[PDB]
Structures are given as structure tokens and as C-alpha cells.
């Protein structure tokens, strides 16, 4: 998640939303990364178990691939510093973030 | 018939050409009157 300061936080919560511009924000207007934009004409959304997010356009009979929602693994989950809002931020105790598509 | 000549109720020209206005008087003032009515 990208905080309004620009620094990166990390949340293990999926109670996502779509805001007025269509982004996937997370219960407080925190934009997920990398940015995922729902088109205004989309009627349904699904997140493939591998992490691919694809919407159902109106008229079109194909759930076009709009984005890939990837996870981040830390060598030390325990060392994350919690800042509230169900978010954790990097500290040198946790280690550098390793961003990968889900599963890999 | 629909081809019989007819005069629309809104007669006359539907356009008006704007008037350029009056040439300024070299009185040293940027403001220029417009012939109050």
C-alpha cells in the first residue's frame, strides 16, 4: 500500500473497495500497489487465485485482464513495525521486501 | 401539401452583425464611453 506520504506500508487485509476514480483502495482510502484501475463500464470483478484481476466489461464477452495484484514476502514477519490502520512498515529488523506474484 | 410556400412566424433575419463601436477620443484616458441611451 502507498501511504499519502509516499512511503510504503504493508497490510494483510483484503476488505478492498473501489473509490470514485475506480482504484482498489483498502478501507480508509489507501491505494494498493501496483495501481489497479477498474474501468467505469465494468459490471463484475474477479481476482484469480494466482492474483490476476480481470473485470467484465459491458457488451464484451471476455473478462479482460486489467491488472496483476502481487504479494510481498519479508524474511521476518515478526519484525514489522505496526503503525495502526492494520498496516505494517519496513524496519531493518524485518529485512528488505521481496515483491512477487502470488504463489511464486 | 407540404410544398406550398409558407412564411415562418419568426420572420426577418436571425443574425445581427456586431457594430465595431466608436473610435476613441485621444483625451489621454483608456476608458471610452459608449453613447449612453
Amino acid at each position: 500500500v502507498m501511504l499519502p506520504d509516499g512511503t510504503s506500508a504493508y497490510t494483510r487485509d483484503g476488505s478492498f473497495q473501489v473509490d470514485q476514480n475506480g482504484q482498489l483502495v483498502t478501507a480508509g482510502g489507501f491505494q494498493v500497489q501496483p495501481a489497479i484501475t477498474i474501468p467505469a463500464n465494468a459490471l463484475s470483478i474477479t481476482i484469480g487465485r494466482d492474483g490476476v484481476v480481470s473485470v467484465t466489461q459491458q457488451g464484451q464477452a471476455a473478462p479482460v485482464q486489467v491488472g496483476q495484484l502481487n504479494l510481498t514476502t519479508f524474511m521476518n514477519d515478526t519484525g514489522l513495525e505496526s503503525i495502526g490502520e492494520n498496516l505494517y512498515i519496513e524496519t531493518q529488523s524485518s529485512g528488505a521486501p521481496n515483491e512477487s506474484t502470488p504463489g511464486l | 401539401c407540404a410544398w406550398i410556400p409558407a412564411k415562418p412566424l419568426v420572420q426577418g433575419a436571425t443574425t445581427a452583425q456586431p457594430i465595431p463601436g466608436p473610435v476613441p477620443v485621444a483625451n489621454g484616458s483608456i476608458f471610452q464611453s459608449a453613447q449612453p441611451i
Binding site: 476514480n21 | 485621444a26 483625451n27 476608458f31
Partner: protein
């Protein structure tokens, strides 16, 4: 008194120029772009003109710029290359314009024509705090257009008197006639004196230069009193006279023996001041006393609220 100090020439005249601009820097304290949409729109227009096209949908939450109005005084006989001073005033919600810079704002007249270009650095004063949302730029505006004038054409020039007066016009005409040839000047009204001058810009300039520095005595103007009522100020002319009367005001009484103090007739300003001071009162009470006195007479002057 010099003719220049109490008269103005017909052809010489000032004009007002206004324009919109932006001030950069400010160490913060700029406009809140959320509540000032025009600031961001103007900044985007400037960026697009310079060659940068910001996407329409963007945050653009900046605080180092402030939308301002720049006002200038187009002087008479303004030349293309000359420079004038400008005043920059904050337009939106900017906190201050301490060390801001005004960027290439066009100053236009009432006809919507660009008459100057203003750009430079704002200077603002560094419990009576100074105005930090309004500054002045010296020589910050360069003229671009020149107003055509009739000066040098014809044979008559009108001298216009501030605070018109028949006696003042007669005195000016008499002084001009005495200094120059017979029939050189003629009063047209209480405020206008027509002076005959030879044809030619140089001759007219020489005649005006000679006339302006002439010494003319100032006759008694009028018995006028000015009451502000907003700044707590009372001013009386040298010609004010006071008629005998009795005045009673709240909490005011004879020093000694009670209220209803007597006011002796005073013919000169010194006597009027002494009598009013003897009728001891603060300026706020003096304003009401003067209003009531004038209403009842006993005050040989006209009082105006400013």
C-alpha cells in the same frame, strides 16, 4: 502656493491597470489549491504554454505559489520602454507573500488591452503587524502601449483646480495674466481656467513649465470641519468660528458648577480651540457636541462625516 500644487493640466491624466498573476516561493504560506481552484488551473495553463502538459486528473497540491492581483498606475505620457511600480495583493487564501516573485503578469486597462508587463520580486514589511498579503514592486512593470494624446494641438489648455473655488479660479487667472501677456488666461467656471498658448508641442511645454511654478496666494477657502467617526479624528479649518451657546453633555460639567457649560463666542481658530478645550471632553464627545451645536447653529462652519 504653486500652480502645480493646486491645479492639474487637461491632457495630463493617470490610468488604472489591473492584471492576474502568480507568486512563487513564499516558503510555504501559499494558497490552498483545494479551496483555490483557479491557482492550479492557471499554473497548469502556464506549464502547458511553457511545454509541459499535466494530466487533467491529478492531485496538484502545492503551497509555494499564490494567485494575486497586480494593480498599476499608467502615468501620463507613458513611453514604451519606461517602467512603473505595481502593487500585488493575494487573491485566494495565501498566508503571506513575504519573499515571493511575480511572474510575467499582463497589466490591462478597462478596454481589455495589455498595457504593461509586470514581473519581479515582492517587497513586504518585515502590536501593529504589517500587511503580509500585500506587497509593492518598484519598477516591476514595463509599459508596452502608448496612449495617443492631443497635447501640442490646438491653442487652448485647460487648468483644472482641485477643490474648485470661484475665488481660487479668479486668483489663478489674475496671476497668469499678470505673469504673461494680457488676456493669457480666462476662468470658465469655479474649477476650469482656459489659457491661450502658442501652437506647437515645444511652445506649449515651455508655457506650461513657466505657468506651473508661479506663486499664487491662497484666499480663505471655507469654514469646514471634518469628523471621521471611524478613526476618532476631528479636524477644524482655520476659518471656523464659534457662536455663543451653552452645551450640556453626559458626564461633562463645569470644572469649578454643574452641567450646561457656557461657550464664549470665538472669532478665530485659537479662540475656538480654547473654548472647546475649556468645555473639556474627549474627541468622541466632541463629535456629538459639534453635531448638536451645528444643528442648533452657534457654529459658523459646515461639518462633514468622513
Amino acid at each position: 502656493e504653486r500652480i502645480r500644487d493646486l491645479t492639474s493640466v487637461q491632457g495630463v491624466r493617470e490610468n488604472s491597470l489591473i492584471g492576474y498573476g502568480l507568486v512563487v516561493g513564499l516558503d510555504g504560506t501559499g494558497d490552498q489549491t483545494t479551496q483555490t481552484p483557479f491557482t492550479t488551473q492557471t499554473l497548469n495553463n502556464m506549464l502547458s504554454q511553457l511545454g509541459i502538459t499535466v494530466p487533467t486528473g491529478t492531485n496538484m497540491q502545492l503551497k509555494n505559489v499564490a494567485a494575486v492581483m497586480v494593480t498599476a498606475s499608467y502615468p501620463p505620457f507613458a513611453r514604451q520602454g519606461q517602467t512603473i511600480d505595481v502593487v500585488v495583493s493575494s487573491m485566494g487564501n495565501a498566508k503571506s507573500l513575504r519573499g515571493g516573485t511575480l511572474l510575467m503578469t499582463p497589466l490591462k486597462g478597462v478596454d481589455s488591452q495589455v498595457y504593461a508587463l509586470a514581473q519581479g520580486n515582492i517587497l513586504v514589511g518585515g502590536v501593529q503587524v504589517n500587511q503580509l498579503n500585500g506587497g509593492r514592486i518598484t519598477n516591476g512593470a514595463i509599459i508596452e502601449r502608448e496612449l495617443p494624446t492631443q497635447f501640442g494641438a490646438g491653442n487652448t489648455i485647460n487648468l483644472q483646480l482641485n477643490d474648485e473655488d470661484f475665488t481660487m479660479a479668479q486668483q489663478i487667472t489674475d496671476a497668469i495674466n499678470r505673469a504673461r501677456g494680457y488676456g493669457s488666461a480666462t476662468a470658465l467656471d469655479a474649477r476650469t481656467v482656459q489659457v491661450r498658448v502658442p501652437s506647437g508641442n515645444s511652445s506649449q511645454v515651455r508655457f506650461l513649465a513657466d505657468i506651473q511654478n508661479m506663486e499664487v496666494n491662497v484666499t480663505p477657502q471655507d469654514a469646514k470641519v471634518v469628523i471621521n467617526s471611524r478613526t476618532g479624528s476631528v479636524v477644524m479649518n482655520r476659518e471656523v468660528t464659534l457662536d455663543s451657546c451653552a452645551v450640556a453633555q453626559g458626564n461633562l460639567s463645569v470644572t469649578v458648577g454643574g452641567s450646561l457649560q457656557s461657550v464664549r463666542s470665538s472669532a478665530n481658530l485659537n479662540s475656538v480651540v480654547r473654548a472647546l478645550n475649556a468645555l473639556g471632553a474627549t474627541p468622541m464627545d466632541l463629535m456629538s457636541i459639534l453635531q448638536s451645536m451645528q444643528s442648533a447653529g452657534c457654529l459658523r462652519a459646515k461639518l462633514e462625516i468622513i
